[PDB]
Design a protein around this nucleic acid. Structure first.
Ligand SMILES: [Mg+2]
Ligand SMILES: [Zn+2]
Lengths: 1320, 653
DNA sequence: GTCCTATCGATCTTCGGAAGAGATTCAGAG
DNA sequence: CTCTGAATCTCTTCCCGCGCGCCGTAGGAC
């Protein structure tokens, strides 16, 4: 057994029992391997930019009769890396270069080119790149593309009751949904006439398509219907009985011959009669003329002699018609079999709607129904009809759509073309008619086998296609008209349409979300959201219980708990922990192979429609350490049904008890106990915790923290193994070991940590070291904590000591009462960093300046600016302080002032300048910083190679060919001028001094390039001269009104900040830190929070025994004994750990991190039994009831009965109150109508909205209302007369008439509608 | 308007008029230059099709756009509907002198107060503050007082605490379904930043305290203060508008405390002695000499208001408990002690409070309600009424009840395994076997909770009502009655599929114990349905109330008595057998339509237009009356309104 | 690079809203 | 031959507050 060097510092005591056979996949492979799938070229041309290019090129005009064609593409390295790009505020992007070859043919000749011109990689655009954290950077702002989930291409059959006609019956419908191009709907009319339409246009008679494919009705009838024949021999019109065509229906008429009668008139027909029908060989039989007089004919019948019609396919027969046509010599008359149950006549019925004659008349009807007002025309019509279904420019089932289609038509194969074909539509019709004949089933729409995930690497491939589609339309024309003589490919194309397409996508699409960089969980659970909304999806306002609800295939694929309750429940889901995207995009999830009777430890991923074909055991099911099930019969799910089945009947097993959830819920301990309301609100509140100041560890967790904090990319992780060379909380630098070094390198990995910086939500993000100088580290160890982490565990909140009890009502209803001790400790203080910016311009009156020489203001304000016109770093500032002394010509003091209300310390400034514009000493101050920071880190390589190279001189001197009359005092390349002879050592000296010079020249260009990065200005917007951004850090504390939450979806405002003496304290005199209310636990059934408290209490107790054993100077062998006795506690828990191997050093180093509570894991559905919590509390010296008697610090009286006390984990949420408290006396008003502005970002007035006005009207209160909506609001006179009457204290109003109502009058009178006020 | 740098905001109409005027410039040209019919029919079409845009863009074949297919908002799009003047700016509009904050509970408030932050009061009341600094002559005028407020000088608070000293401020949450959703309170100043609201009133707002923001408005004029104090002040609104039922209905912790205070425990310290009054009952409690729920006898006095309305005071021994003696001290002097002499719970105390309003009236009732609140909080504290997992009680018969029912389900299965029962019958009987198990588990668990308390009566054990923590909360009506405790420790029971059809194998577990993965996953088909319903419903409910006020708003009570003799007839609603509502629900407080006779003949009982107030409806309940004819607003023959008598009792008064 | 003039007058606006009601379109017949 | 039934089309409605976040005419000709 082994633990990595960052595990072996706080080995979380694990209570899990099921052995985790599959370790959690890298939590963002959803995203990264999607974008990698876009960005890689791939000669198997599907997927990626290359697939899109090969979707358009080769490209040509017929009249140009020449082409240009895509050869290959290259993607250059990005002009600025992520860190610098995120400073400079551009987007992190890469230049796209494409080998286009233009080919010039000739007339008359064979096509052999007159010339062709490979343009040496024409520039095509700048595609953004994904950062390894899975995020794009789009205008310095960091953005995330959520995966979409939408209806896969294919064919889908559907039906409903009551939603249509409601006379008990149901109507059936088929759709073909291509990936790109037109939708085709087939549907029956109630009277089972069949109809078709494109793109939800008008309804058409369905055979209009078969007509359009030029089947005659005779052929259609041979495609759809079974034949029944009459042979006019042995007697007039004998009949071809196929026996099985009579079963269950009544023999209402005479059928007999030759010996035993099968079934006489009026009786059902059955098997024994059919067998007698077979044994008599009923190949022809006598039937009454009423039977033939029922028929509809199959085939066309002219009279050959007159040459003229008597009957036609699907025309209906009668005795006299039969007589004349058989009399005309047509001795075989042929018709259809149409039993109403099994063979309904729907296509013949459709031929009774049909207005068409044949192909052309249908194409006429198509073109007139689709493009009303354009002329139909034989040469023109096909340029509609073919581009509906048969042409690549406008119809495309991708490979997934073809697969799904073929699977539903039960085809043998799935390598198929993306267009339809005649037989491809006909098969849909046949399958739809089988459904109406009752012999088939409709698909469940909302099934994760019918909806597939699209992620970034596919949405961007489509938007890039829209680009190439608009270049198609330009380049075809330019090629067709062009001379082909001077044009080269970089004339043929230009980037602007591609760049528009892709930049608008990544910038502004409904799915290019601005990342919730709130804390490391919220980064991740956002990068793996599954969204039903957006382009090609549904809409949040326009769906109902059919899709919001969970479905049985969600299990293991989508988390049922973690969805953002509100107007879009379940239109957003979170992709479950273990789930994965299949090749095609369907969600698939890993299961264990059950081989005969033993659970084999191999995992097969199952998609949602493989799963229904097996029976799959629930993850809890026990096994015998050989791996046979222990239970003789076991719970499994099967076909959405679940039940018990035999041992060795079951065929797959779940991989882990965590498989059903997302990371967002998988982090709740004891989830096994909570109402799924309160699980949901928990798993939504964890992603809102703001990173507190001094974050640590949850004492009770699930062991998922060790993964969320690492995979979220925000802790800095050791890229290669080695030893820590230096640390200073800004840099960490690692001497990588030679077993993982690359041979020419210096061999030294710096990590410049990010310090105090705004998150996208204004919380700070300073990384801090966890290493010590000279400490060893191994690849993948956490070197530095992120925000909200410590030692690499996720740590959103603080393990506050809580007791559950009423307290004089301060924790009524939900509220949290808090002791002053928590605020004094800086437990929940949090740092909020704002960014304020002053732009400056080349305006129409002339160019602005930044200066201290501001007009109309004296040193009373300017004392905080430097001499340049920017605030000093470390200035502490408040409302109205001038941060940046901008001024405008013709001079106007327009300068950046700190907005009202806010306050903070100015932690940093940045300065950006156009080209050809002068700097200033705060630009030179920033240059001095950044230059020096680049140069230092470069020197720490050049120094290391210089030292190595002079050793490489010294050693092969000192070992042999010594010249050491004096040695180390000398400049170690002046060592060359010593008198060594022209034996090889002097030539080694000369060569290695040339290697030393070239080592200098190497950095002599590397530092020049770096300084050139810093020396330059930046790509400002048009009009601006320069911009400066100034950052205010605020250390906000905690106060009444702030919100805190547990993990269990318990939440409250904190209501009072009680002084320590008022907190309850125990029989040992320690006060409780928080007092939660009890009644919420039964009333909202989230009792898992109690077991977290008790297990938390035990967690404190073990640290309590350890801390005592470190204050007392216990020897390690006794201390190790107690720690070991803690890890081995419980049943056959999964984990094993041997402090015997920890070398004493690391036992003390471990104890020094347990000494405030042993951290515990309670994996989600696999937790501690109660009997193991008691066992831990007994190992501490604690009361196993979990409860303690408490006393009230207001009197020292005892409380009656003990109360729960223990260490809950509590999160401060980002809804803290000073960010919401607001009030307005008077200030701005809007221009169009004079009502007040609305906001906090503007000094706004609260909306006395519509419902409040009914509320006043429902008291008698008329004067209040009159005021509220005029004098206080709108009447431009009355409010200034009111204000003066109030300062005069007159308490009287003059109410007038609101100016918004006069706006209405003019806006009506701006129609030709004379509205007017009237007098009497 | 210009925006960020030298760019005009795309100001839609000016793009529409621009279309028109361009087209008109061309059409004047091509008319005067005398173009042929086909050309002028072109421009004339394009002009008509442009003025079409300017009036009501998008009633055309397609709305015209100037961006990524954003339709430009035309005039008629400015008038109508949810973003247009009538709803957006006329009917309700933003207002000055307002602010908002997170509310938080303030237990010490008297019912009429709320605390609001000094920062807000100072930024809200500014006009009134200037109206004192000039009146002190301490500031020269606005120009100085503005600065003197900005500097936040030491005087200003003593001025503020004179400005505000009794100026009602209006607090309302949003949405605000009903009149009780805006109320006025006298403010009291606070150091923090939250609005301290009164505990009992949070229920009216449906203000939970979990971070639920609330807006405040100052009324400016004298008339707005007189309306606020007379009508909207919380003391004037103890009743619902909708039904004769209090809205001050006690907060869960208050009723928990009063339940705990008034129980009897058959063994206690100081049990069985005899006392001369509540005061020495309290000395006995507070010194720790008697336990609060100990049995005792006390001398009591109580008061009754006679047939005239004047007090008769009476005195007796009473047999009771220490805590019922202490609680009697809070009741105003006119109620009978028989209302307190019982272990109180949420229904029992609501009627307590209601009877106070019945007998004394409003002004004592609001103070009595305040005292109840303070009392319940204080004894609920001493009670230490915690919750703890050792207090979840599982009846061990549960194990047998499953192990029995499982085989009987397998009997239904074995018949099915022999074809001996139909595919419908197998299912619809199995789910009834699970129901028969579930009722038994629930019944055994409620018996076990009551069973957990038994104690030595100085010799031999005897049982009493269980002090088990979760059972106090159910049996008191604080929170979480039968349907919750059943799930916490009984069984979770049957669950339903998405299409409502029932699961063949229930959740026989409960949240004290673990759900396995499947039981949990099926559990979410419940809860996610219930959340989808909430988020989906909250639209249609609002569109319903809109349609209603916007049809009802034309009515006002406008005559005293329209003079009808017509009306409609009220009976208990008798259906499905028994009566689902008695007559005293329907008829109370309407006026009689016609003379109401004695059951029988010729004896009249109520004159023909008398309000049937409570003493009349109790009288009808003394009689064998079944049907009563009353006036109803549908029959009131007032034109353009309703007469008062036809409407009858005002429920809030 | 700036200023002025115009929109697919050589396509393709999205299927995944329901409803609920009206205006407007057609049966079986006196 | 069109008169009362019914049939397909479009129009209109869809909680209240609130807080962030960003993003914001183009193309051609002189
Ligand atoms: Mg709330
Ligand atoms: Zn009336």
């Amino acid at each position: 057994m082994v633990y990595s060097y960052t595990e072996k510092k706080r080995i979380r005591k694990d209570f899990g029992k099921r052995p985790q056979v599959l370790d959690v996949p890298y939590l963002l492979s959803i995203q990264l391997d999607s974008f990698q799938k876009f960005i890689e070229q791939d000669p198997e041309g599907q997927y990626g930019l290359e697939a899109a290019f090969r979707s358009v090129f080769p490209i040509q005009s017929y009249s140009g009769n020449s082409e240009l064609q895509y050869v290959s593409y290259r993607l250059g390295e990005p002009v600025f890396d992520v860190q610098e790009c995120q400073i400079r505020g551009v987007t992190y992007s890469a230049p796209l270069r494409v080998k286009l070859r233009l080919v010039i043919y000739e007339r008359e000749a064979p096509e052999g080119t007159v010339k062709d011109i490979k343009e040496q990689e024409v520039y095509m655009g700048e595609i953004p790149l994904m950062t390894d954290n899975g995020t794009f950077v789009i205008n310095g702002t960091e953005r995330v593309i959520v995966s979409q989930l939408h209806r896969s291409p294919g064919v889908f059959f559907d039906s409903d009751k009551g939603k249509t006609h409601s006379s008990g019956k149901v109507l059936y419908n088929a759709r073909i949904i291509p990936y790109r191009g037109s939708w085709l709907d087939f549907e029956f009319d109630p009277k089972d006439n069949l109809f078709v339409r494109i793109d939800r246009r008008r309804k058409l008679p369905a055979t209009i398509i078969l007509r359009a494919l030029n089947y005659t009705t005779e052929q259609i009838l041979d495609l759809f219907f079974e034949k029944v024949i009459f042979e006019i021999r042995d007697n007039k019109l004998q009949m071809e009985l196929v026996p099985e065509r009579l079963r269950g229906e009544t023999a209402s008429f005479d059928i007999e011959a030759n010996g035993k009668v099968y079934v006489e008139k009026g009786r059902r027909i059955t098997a024994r009669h059919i067998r007698q029908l077979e044994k008599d060989d009923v190949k022809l039989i006598e039937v009454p003329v009423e039977y033939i007089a029922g028929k509809v004919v199959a085939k066309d019948y002219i009279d050959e002699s007159t040459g003229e019609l008597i009957c036609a396919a699907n025309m209906e027969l009668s005795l006299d018609l039969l007589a004349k046509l058989s009399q005309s010599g047509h001795k075989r008359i042929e018709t259809l079999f149409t039993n109403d149950l099994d063979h309904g006549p729907y296509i013949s019925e459709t031929l009774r709607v049909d207005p068409t004659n044949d192909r052309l008349s249908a194409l006429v009807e198509i073109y007139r129904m689709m493009r009303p007002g354009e002329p139909p025309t034989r040469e023109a019509a096909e340029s509609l009809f073919e581009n509906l279904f048969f042409s690549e420019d406008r119809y495309d089932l991708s490979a997934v759509g073809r697969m799904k289609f073929n699977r539903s038509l039960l085809r043998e194969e799935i390598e198929g073309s993306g267009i339809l074909s005649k037989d491809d539509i006909i098969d849909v019709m046949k399958k739809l008619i089988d459904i109406r004949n009752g012999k088939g089933e409709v698909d469940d729409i909302d099934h994760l086998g019918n909806r597939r995930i699209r992620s970034v690497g596919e949405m961007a491939e489509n938007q890039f296609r829209v680009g190439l589609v608009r270049v198609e339309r330009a380049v075809k024309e330019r090629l067709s008209l062009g001379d082909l003589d001077t044009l080269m490919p970089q004339d043929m194309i230009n980037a602007k349409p591609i760049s528009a397409a892709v930049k608008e996508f990544f910038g502004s699409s409904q799915l290019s979300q601005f990342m919730d960089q709130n804390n490391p969980l919220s980064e991740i659970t956002h990068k793996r959201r599954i969204s039903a909304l957006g382009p090609g999806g549904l809409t949040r306002e326009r769906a109902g219980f059919e899709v919001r609800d969970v479905h049985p295939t969600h299990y293991g694929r989508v988390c049922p708990i973690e969805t953002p309750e509100g107007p879009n429940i379940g239109l957003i889901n979170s992709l479950s922990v273990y789930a994965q995207t299949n090749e095609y995009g369907f969600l698939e999830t890993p299961y264990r192979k059950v081989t005969d009777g033993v659970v084999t430890d191999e995992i097969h991923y199952l998609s949602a429609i493989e799963e229904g074909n097996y029976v799959i055991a629930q993850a809890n099911s026990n096994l015998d350490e050989e791996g046979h099930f222990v239970e003789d019969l076991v719970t499994c799910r099967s076909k959405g049904e679940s039940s018990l089945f035999s041992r060795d009947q079951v065929d797959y097993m779940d991989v882990s008890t965590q498989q059903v959830v997302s990371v967002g819920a998988s982090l709740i301990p004891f989830l096994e106990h909570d109402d799924a309301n309160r699980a949901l609100m928990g798993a939504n509140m964890q992603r809102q915790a703001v990173p507190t100041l001094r974050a640590d560890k949850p004492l009770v967790g699930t062991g998922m923290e060790r993964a969320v904090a690492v995979d979220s990319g925000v802790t800095a992780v050791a890229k290669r193994g080695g030893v820590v060379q230096y640390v200073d909380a800004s840099r960490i630098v690692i001497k990588v070991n030679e077993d993982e070094m690359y041979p020419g390198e210096a061999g030294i990995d710096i990590y410049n940590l990010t310090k105090y910086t705004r998150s996208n939500q204004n919380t700070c993000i300073n990384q801090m070291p966890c290493v010590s100088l000279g400490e060893p580290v191994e690849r993948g160890d956490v070197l530095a904590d992120g925000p909200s982490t410590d030692l690499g565990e996720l740590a959103l909140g603080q393990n506050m000591r809580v007791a559950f009890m009423p307290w004089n009502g301060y924790n009524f209803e939900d509220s949290i009462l808090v002791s002053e001790r928590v605020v004094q400790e800086d437990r929940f203080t949090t740092i909020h960093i704002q960014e304020l910016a002053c732009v400056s311009r080349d305006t129409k009156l002339g160019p602005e300046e930044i200066t201290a020489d501001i007009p109309n203001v004296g040193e009373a304000a300017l004392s905080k600016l430097d001499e340049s016109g920017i605030v000093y770093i470390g200035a502490e500032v408040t409302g109205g302080d001038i941060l940046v002394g901008k001024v405008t010509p013709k001079v106007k003091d327009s300068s950046l002032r700190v907005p009202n209300g806010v306050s903070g310390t100015v932690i940093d400034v940045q300065v950006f300048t156009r080209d050809g514009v002068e700097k200033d000493k705060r630009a030179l101050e920033i240059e001095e910083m950044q230059l020096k920071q680049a140069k230092k880190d470069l020197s720490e390589e050049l120094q290391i190679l210089e030292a190595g190279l002079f050793s490489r001189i010294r050693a092969v001197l000192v070992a042999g060919g010594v010249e050491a009359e004096k040695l180390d005092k000398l400049p170690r390349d002046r060592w060359l001028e010593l008198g060594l002879t022209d034996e090889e050592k002097q030539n080694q000296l000369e060569q290695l001094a040339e290697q030393y010079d070239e080592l200098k020249h190497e950095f002599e260009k590397k530092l020049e390039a770096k300084r050139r990065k810093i020396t330059q200005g930046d790509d400002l917007a048009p009009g601006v001269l320069k911009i400066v951004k100034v950052y205010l850090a605020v250390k906000r504390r905690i106060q009444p009104g702030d919100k805190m939450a547990g993990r269990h979806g318990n939440k409250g405002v904190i209501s009072k900040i009680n002084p320590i003496e008022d907190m309850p304290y125990d029989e040992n005199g320690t006060p409780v830190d928080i007092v939660l209310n009890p009644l919420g636990v039964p009333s909202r059934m989230n009792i898992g929070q109690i077991l977290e408290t008790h297990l938390g209490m035990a967690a404190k107790g073990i640290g309590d025994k350890i801390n005592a054993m470190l204050k007392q100077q216990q020897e390690v062998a006794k201390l190790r004994e107690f720690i070991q006795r803690a890890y081995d506690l419980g049943a056959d828990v999964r984990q094993k750990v041997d402090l015997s191997t920890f070398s004493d050093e690391e036992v003390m180093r471990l104890a020094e991190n347990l000494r405030k509570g042993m951290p515990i894991a309670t994996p989600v559905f696999d937790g501690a039994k109660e009997a193991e919590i008691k066992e831990l509390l007994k190992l501490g010296d604690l009361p196993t009831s979990g409860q303690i008697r408490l006393y009230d610090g207001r009197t020292g009286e005892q409380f009656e009965r003990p109360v729960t006390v223990g260490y809950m984990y509590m999160l401060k949420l980002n809804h803290l109150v000073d960010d919401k408290m607001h009030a307005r006396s008077t200030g701005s008003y809007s221009l169009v109508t004079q009502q007040p502005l609305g906001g906090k970002a503007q000094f706004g007035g609260q909306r006395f909205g519509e419902m409040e006005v009914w509320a006043l009207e429902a008291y008698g209160a008329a004067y209040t209302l009159q005021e509220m909506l005029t004098v206080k609001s709108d009447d431009v006179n009355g409010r200034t007369k009111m204000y003066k009457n109030i300062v005069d204290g007159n308490h009287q109003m003059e109410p007038g008439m609101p100016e918004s109502f006069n706006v209405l009058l003019k806006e009506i009178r701006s129609l030709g509608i004379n509205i007017e006020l009237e007098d009497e | 308007v210009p925006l960020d740098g030298g760019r005009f905001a795309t100001s839609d109409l000016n793009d529409l008029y621009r279309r028109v005027i361009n087209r008109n410039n061309r059409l004047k040209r091509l008319l005067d230059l005398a173009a042929p019919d086909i050309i002028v029919r072109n421009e004339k079409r394009m002009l008509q099709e442009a003025v079409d845009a300017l009036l009501d863009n998008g009633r055309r074949g397609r709305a015209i756009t100037g961006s990524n297919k954003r339709p430009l908002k035309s005039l008629a799009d400015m008038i109508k509907g949810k973003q247009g003047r009538f709803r957006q700016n006329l009917l309700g509009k933003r207002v000055d002198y307002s602010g908002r904050s997170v509310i938080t509970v303030g237990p010490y408030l008297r019912l009429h107060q709320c605390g609001l932050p000094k920062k807000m009061a100072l930024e809200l009341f500014k006009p009134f503050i200037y109206g004192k600094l000039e009146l002190r002559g301490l500031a020269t005028t606005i120009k100085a007082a503005k600065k003197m407020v900005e500097r936040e000088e030491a005087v200003v608070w003593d001025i503020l605490d004179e400005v505000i000293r009794e100026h009602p401020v209006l607090l309302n949450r949003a949405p605000t379904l009903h009149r009780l959703g805006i109320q006025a309170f006298e403010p009291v100043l606070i150091e923090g930043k939250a609005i301290q609201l009164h505990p009992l009133v949070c229920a009216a707002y449906n203000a939970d305290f979990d971070g639920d923001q609330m807006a405040v408005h100052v009324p400016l004029t004298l008339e707005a203060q007189l309306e606020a104090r007379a009508l909207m002040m919380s003391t004037n609104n103890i009743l619902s508008p909708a039904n004769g039922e209090p809205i001050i209905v006690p907060s869960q912790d208050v009723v928990l405390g009063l339940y705990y205070m008034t129980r009897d425990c058959v063994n206690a310290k100081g049990e069985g002695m005899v006392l001369t009054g509540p005061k020495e009952a309290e000395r006995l409690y507070r010194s720790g000499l008697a336990s609060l729920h100990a049995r005792v006898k006390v001398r009591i006095t109580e008061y009754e208001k006679d047939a005239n309305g004047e007090l008769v005071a009476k005195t007796s021994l009473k047999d009771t408990t220490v805590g019922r003696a202490i609680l009697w001290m809070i009741v105003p002097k006119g109620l009978p002690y028989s209302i307190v002499n019982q272990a109180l719970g949420k229904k029992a105390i609501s009627k307590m409070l209601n009877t106070c309003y019945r007998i004394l009236g409003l002004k004592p009732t609001v103070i009595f309600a305040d005292q109840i609140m303070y009392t319940g909080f204080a004894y609920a504290a001493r009670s230490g009424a915690s919750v703890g997992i050792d207090d979840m009680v599982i009846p061990e018969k549960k194990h047998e009840i499953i192990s029995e029912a499982e085989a009987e389900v397998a009997e239904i299965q074995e018949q099915f395994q022999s074809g001996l029962v139909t595919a419908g019958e197998r299912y619809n009987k199995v789910i009834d076997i699970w129901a028969a198990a579930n009722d038994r588990v629930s019944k055994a668990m409620m018996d076990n909770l009551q069973t957990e308390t038994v104690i030595n009566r100085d010799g031999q054990e005897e049982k009493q009502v269980s002090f088990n923590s979760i059972y106090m909360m159910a049996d008191s009506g604080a929170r979480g009655s039968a349907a919750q405790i059943r799930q916490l420790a009984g069984m979770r029971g049957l669950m339903a599929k998405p299409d409502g059809s029932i699961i063949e194998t229930p959740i026989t577990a409960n949240f004290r114990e673990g759900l396995n993965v499947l039981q949990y996953f099926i559990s979410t088909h419940g809860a996610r349905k219930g959340l989808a319903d909430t988020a989906l419903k909250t639209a249609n409910s609002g569109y319903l109330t809109r349609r209603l006020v916007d049809v009802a708003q034309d009515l006002v009570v406008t005559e005293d008595d329209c003079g009808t003799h017509e009306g409609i007839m009220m009976t208990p609603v008798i259906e499905g057998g028994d009566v689902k509502e008695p007559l005293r629900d329907r008829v109370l407080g309407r006026v009689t339509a016609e003379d109401v006779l004695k059951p029988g003949t010729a004896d009249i009982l109520v004159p023909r237009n008398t309000l049937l107030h409570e003493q009349w409806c109790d009288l009808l309940e003394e009689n064998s009356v079944d049907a009563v004819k009353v006036r109803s607003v549908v029959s009131c023959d007032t034109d353009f309104g309703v007469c008062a008598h036809c409407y009858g009792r005002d429920l809030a008064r």
